[PDB]
Ligand binder design. Structure first.
Ligand SMILES: NCCCNC(=O)NC[C@H]1O[C@@H](n2c(C#CCN(CC(=O)O)C[C@H]3O[C@@H](n4cnc5c(N)ncnc54)[C@H](O)[C@@H]3O)nc3c(N)ncnc32)[C@H](O)[C@@H]1O
Ligand SMILES: NCCCNC(=O)NC[C@H]1O[C@@H](n2c(C#CCN(CC(=O)O)C[C@H]3O[C@@H](n4cnc5c(N)ncnc54)[C@H](O)[C@@H]3O)nc3c(N)ncnc32)[C@H](O)[C@@H]1O
Ligand SMILES: NCCCNC(=O)NC[C@H]1O[C@@H](n2c(C#CCN(CC(=O)O)C[C@H]3O[C@@H](n4cnc5c(N)ncnc54)[C@H](O)[C@@H]3O)nc3c(N)ncnc32)[C@H](O)[C@@H]1O
Ligand SMILES: NCCCNC(=O)NC[C@H]1O[C@@H](n2c(C#CCN(CC(=O)O)C[C@H]3O[C@@H](n4cnc5c(N)ncnc54)[C@H](O)[C@@H]3O)nc3c(N)ncnc32)[C@H](O)[C@@H]1O
Lengths: 261, 261, 261, 261
């Protein structure tokens, strides 16, 4: 099948990628980084995140595989020592594909821009004070004052969302989760405090109150947007697909990453 | 239709129930507290919780309606002043039914007991130290040391779960959420910390380590169980049905209860 | 000097105590468990806590030393392998004494009882719902609804207080810290949420609202008190004294117990 | 006495200041904004913060007074309606002065800069990832990865510190409190999590690991510092003095600001 391999770019990852390419040469596999059907990522979660965004226009035609060369890799299923067995199983095919939900961010100006997030999308102020009205399905829910907000996919819940006190959600749940960053709460200013978990087709809109300039992050990418009228969050209709060759359940992955391994 | 009305039992609620019965007498409505199709609860959430558990064997044949006579009532949709309009709309029928998920708790001994929860089920120790192994879909996830654990339905997430730092989840999500109560974490003892959100068909089992006696709560009911071998949590296949006569969205209900009203 | 040794009571601790007694026999040291000047505790923090409460009437005439035989021991300064060096240094004397603050709990009825805590004192309800008015220096501060409250000494801040989200406080600060256990907060019920840190001479009183029966803990001891009119917390004028033979700073002790060792 | 009055600069505050100046003209009071002995601040806490920093070189010779013209004012003791009584009492003198502790921040380069904070000093990264080693009294305590750190005075504990989960500390306690902003914790990265409370003479140093550029805030002032070798926190020897004309206790001030008023 058509395939490509991204590398973190250190010596370990580059040589691992070269050896897999050499191994792939022994099968009906064509290296193609324009229209791959299989995208392998060799490095950390940052590397896997960059592989996702490199091919976010072809998510429907691609299955992803992560190899972690450090001690981490939540999106990784394979250690560097299993790489030969990965080549062989991937060549013979017959893998099972699993899909995780993604988050759609729409940014409107006074012009529209959409982004897709695998981990989360966050909003902070452009230096000044961050104040936004939070509107859920056209209902004014709260006026948020504080550092920012974080909207997470299910597989993102173990990332920034976790550090903000959010819940960890199994990725079979088509949802997104909103967490607060250092909200101000006194007798005049009130936010819900708790993380909020939204189903598909629910729309969370953030609307400016004074300043209209915000720093918006999508996974690792952070951009300053000016003249923002609205930031709109919904569960995407698009999904990321992983090639799975063995059982590595989400809650064991959580256990291995946070409890012990 | 067949109907019945439970009351909190103070003067306000008893007289409101009597006036609705008098009002219902002017329609083809039969008061029947054995096999009602409509169960009205006049009081607080405690009163609504008791109405649910009074009829938990007929959940499939019943639509519930809550009237709050205090300043509260998350499961209430109606103030006492709208009661006449409620009688009339309920008599004419043509309401829409909505369903919220429920939580199944199974308790095994060395003998089995199942319970249904609308808010949550919690586990604490019988005086001694609480230590349980947490097993998710037969995978040992963690050994929990601390005060206890709380497993919440979606509509329970605004109740005890919220006070434990859990996320608020829209009830259209068929899930349950596990929160920690004062976990011990040092270099030898480790829990995940974060709330965990589980989909349908996922099974969370709690298994004793030393003591086998636990205080188990199901909504307001708290029972000491002895010789416990396992406590098993899953999303129930049963659902509670509410009669809805107008739009009162979950997130507005959350806003009204916690932000402002 | 006069000394005594308490043991956890397993084989390791009993034989360690016997060997130290044998070692102490080679110096001008008299074993006396009625009026010791040195109290050695061999076991865990539970064992050290029991040694403190065994001699809480002679705190001014006693220096404590902890030996941890497990992997833990926040109040321990010594591993079992250093016990011979401990005997020798303790015999030669010339140690430095350090003092940590303690917490005074006063419980009034309709009759008065005082208790001294090294870790903390907690209050919960006797089965029913816990509601108390919190009065600081005779000023009504809040009405607490929830599971309970925890008042911690500085050295207790790394114990139950920590699991409740409290701050870790250096023991040179003569203070006590109040933390909430699962407080109810909605638009009608409001608590401060945050831990509160009180100086010496500040008095925190808890006063019942409906039920007057409470479960009160003092370190490991938990007693049900009936007909309670008031629970009064203040920093004690009494202090626990530790014999110190080398520098083991509080923040390194915290690092070793929670970060890495 | 020598006095001056800062104003927020809206119509309400400017006219209030003019009326107090007119009122002060009827007493032996000289308006002097170079060497005042009394500094009155008319506005919000932001206004009071700016008054403190305008005169931070003469803290020993100045007593501060806050008048809040909005609904807030933690450092304010007076509403605009009491301003005439304030002029009269301040003219007759015989007020009592109270002192709150302050925080010293030292920033070293490869050159030294010191700052004084009334609320807090915070550190974040200059766009990249924030990683610092936390050294307490020359002991390496932890390597912090996350959004940033916040070091708070006692009177700052109700401000940013509170929103970060920190404890509220009575200002008679000469301490500073360190809180985490969204720390990363997994099986490879570990921070203490809990807020840390440090006494006088304890030194907290933050030392870079990779990037040496940081955004450092001191109260409202936020500056990007380059080539930073160390950020050093200690309780200052300097104190802010407030003129007090009546009892308004700290815990009532907390109650009024966060519970009800
Ligand atoms: N954008 C600022 C860069 C600083 N963040 C950072 O050092 N994160 C890397 C660590 O997180 C792990 N990770 C990832 C990741 C990654 C790569 N990362 C770096 C890059 O791409 O350059 C971007 C992400 O970073 C996270 N992040 C940012 N700030 C914080 C914070 N304060 N606390 C916690 N996470 C934070 C956000 O969610 C970004 O999306 N996804 C997951 C996951 N699904 N589950 C469990 N672990 C996961 C990864 O293995 C490693 O252990
Ligand atoms: N079992 C000990 C009794 C003490 N609990 C108590 O006074 N709760 C009543 C308050 O909570 C509101 N509520 C209910 C409720 C109710 C009735 N309640 C009393 C009864 O039945 O006697 C039993 C429930 O109590 C909750 N609970 C227990 N302990 C705590 C705690 N520490 N913190 C927060 N909640 C707690 C548990 O989830 C029980 O199921 N469901 C929801 C909901 N879905 N959404 C939002 N508000 C809700 C209700 O309007 C009122 O404002
Ligand atoms: N009363 C229920 C018994 C269950 N508690 C329990 O297993 N605690 C033992 C663990 O905590 C460590 N510890 C102690 C201790 C001890 C002995 N303990 C047992 C006994 O005496 O039987 C009584 C204390 O327990 C604590 N506790 C109770 N419940 C919780 C909870 N949910 N979360 C966290 N702590 C809790 C309270 O503060 C009691 O005072 N002091 C400190 C300290 N100063 N600093 C750091 N670690 C410390 C000790 O090394 C061991 O690792
Ligand atoms: N630097 C970014 C500006 C955004 N911050 C903001 O709107 N804060 C104002 C609100 O906080 C109250 N306040 C102050 C204050 C003030 C003036 N403020 C604005 C200015 O000077 O322009 C600077 C301070 O802001 C705080 N801050 C910043 N970010 C957050 C956050 N995410 N969450 C909570 N607080 C935050 C920090 O501690 C700064 O020092 N001191 C106290 C206190 N001692 N006790 C209780 N309330 C207090 C004040 O009445 C008002 O209700």
């Amino acid at each position: 099948m058509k395939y490509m391999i991204t590398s973190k770019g250190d010596e370990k990852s580059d040589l691992l990628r070269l050896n897999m390419i050499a191994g792939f040469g022994e099968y009906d596999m064509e290296y193609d980084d324009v229209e791959p059907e299989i995208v392998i990522s060799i490095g950390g979660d940052g590397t896997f995140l960059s592989a996702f965004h490199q091919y976010e226009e072809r998510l429907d035609e691609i299955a992803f595989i992560g190899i972690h060369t450090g001690h981490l890799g939540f999106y990784a299923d394979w250690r560097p020592a299993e790489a030969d067995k990965l080549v062989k199983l991937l060549a013979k095919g017959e893998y099972q594909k699993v899909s995780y939900p993604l988050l759609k961010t729409t940014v409107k100006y006074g012009k529209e821009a959409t982004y897709l997030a695998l981990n989360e999308s966050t909003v902070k102020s452009s230096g000044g004070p961050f104040v936004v009205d939070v509107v859920i399905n056209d209902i004014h829910f709260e006026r948020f004052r504080g550092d920012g907000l974080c909207m997470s996919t299910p597989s993102g819940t173990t990332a920034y969302n976790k550090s903000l006190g959010g819940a960890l959600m199994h990725p079979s749940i088509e949802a997104m989760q909103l967490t607060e960053m250092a909200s101000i709460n006194n007798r005049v200013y009130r936010t819900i405090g708790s993380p909020l978990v939204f189903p598909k087709h629910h729309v969370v809109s953030l609307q400016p109150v004074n300043d209209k300039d915000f720093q918006i992050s999508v996974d690792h990418l952070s951009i300053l947007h000016r003249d923002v009228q609205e930031i709109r969050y919904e569960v995407s209709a698009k999904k990321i697909h992983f090639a799975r060759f063995r059982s590595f359940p989400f809650w064991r992955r959580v256990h291995d990453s946070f409890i012990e391994d």
